Amino acid sequence: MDFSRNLYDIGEQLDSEDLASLKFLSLDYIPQRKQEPIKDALMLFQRLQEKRMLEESNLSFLKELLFRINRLDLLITYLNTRKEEMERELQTPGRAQISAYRVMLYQISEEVSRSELRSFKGGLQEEISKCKLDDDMNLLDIFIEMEKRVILGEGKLDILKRVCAQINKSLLKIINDYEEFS
């Protein structure tokens, strides 16, 4: 049971915030109902195994997930993969199992502070009730709610650009780079 031991060892090094980041980054393969009861990395790994995405002979998805959340130490320590190999592999078309849209959204979420979060919540109060704009809701929850209310998506980005135009300017540069990726 070496594989289970390695997976448990990897899961012991992830805290609540990283678990939430992984849960947000794995929306395309785990629906809301299967995602709500998840409170630890072991449940997420079991769910990934059930769909035959993570196994002994297929570690690509786990490597990608651990690379995109920037936890580069676990890759070298346990999975035995350096940064150069992942950087070379990801840029090859057809070898990325996570859409660039989600990565861009998470990168944007990384660059928001508490004051910026409050400004973002105040700006987007037009179409969202104050009950869903509570202090518990972080930026990822706001993005998920916007996706649910079909005001933000792959084809819909004007609202995000307009909202980000007030808080900062480099966010528009990131969005333009993502558009260049298209």
Binding site: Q32, R33, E36, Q49, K51, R52, K148, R149
Partner: protein, 172 residues
């Protein structure tokens, strides 16, 4: 092709069993037990390797497909593309909707639908599939009309699933 059915039924989940029963409601009264349903399906001759593989594919349990039935995703995908003998599109869409609602959303749905349904009929702490089958029994949601379901789903501020309904309806 008899003992593997015991392993399959013992390797499943309660909510998974409920979804399986909902999917198999298309093909008589459904037995309360999954083992009895499998036995009846085998007795009728409907049970088959391809049909069972497609049924397990419809619930996203590929680990059991490779573990027990010695099949991969490509083979079952091709077999389903050839012909969907057992299940139909409507039940698949209903399961897809049911799998995308959290506890708060289904609680709000049952609260809203408590209007013209008895308190004991829906009770509480139920799944979306139970509400769907209750509405099917009451005969107000059928593959021909889904306007009431769409209106109720829009009322709880969930428009993406309304798109899903629109895309499914416009597919034909």
């Amino acid at each position: 092709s008899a003992e593997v059915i015991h392993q399959v039924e013992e390797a499943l989940d309660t909510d998974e069993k409920e979804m399986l029963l909902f999917l198999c409601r298309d093909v008589d009264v459904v037995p309360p037990n999954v083992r009895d349903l499998l036995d009846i399906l085998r007795e009728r001759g409907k049970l088959s390797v391809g049909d069972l593989a497609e049924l397990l594919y419809r619930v996203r349990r590929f680990d059991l497909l490779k573990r027990i039935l010695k099949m991969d995703r490509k083979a079952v995908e091709t077999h389903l593309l050839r012909n969907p003998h057992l299940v139909s599109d409507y039940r698949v869409l209903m399961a897809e909707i049911g799998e995308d609602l959290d506890k708060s959303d289904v609680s709000s749905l049952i609260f809203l639908m408590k209007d013209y349904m008895g308190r004991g009929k829906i009770s509480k702490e139920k799944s979306f599939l139970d509400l769907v089958v209750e509405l099917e029994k009451l005969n107000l949601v059928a593959p021909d009309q889904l306007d009431l379901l769409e209106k109720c789903l829009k009322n709880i501020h969930r428009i993406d699933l309304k798109t899903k309904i629109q895309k499914y309806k416009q597919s034909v």
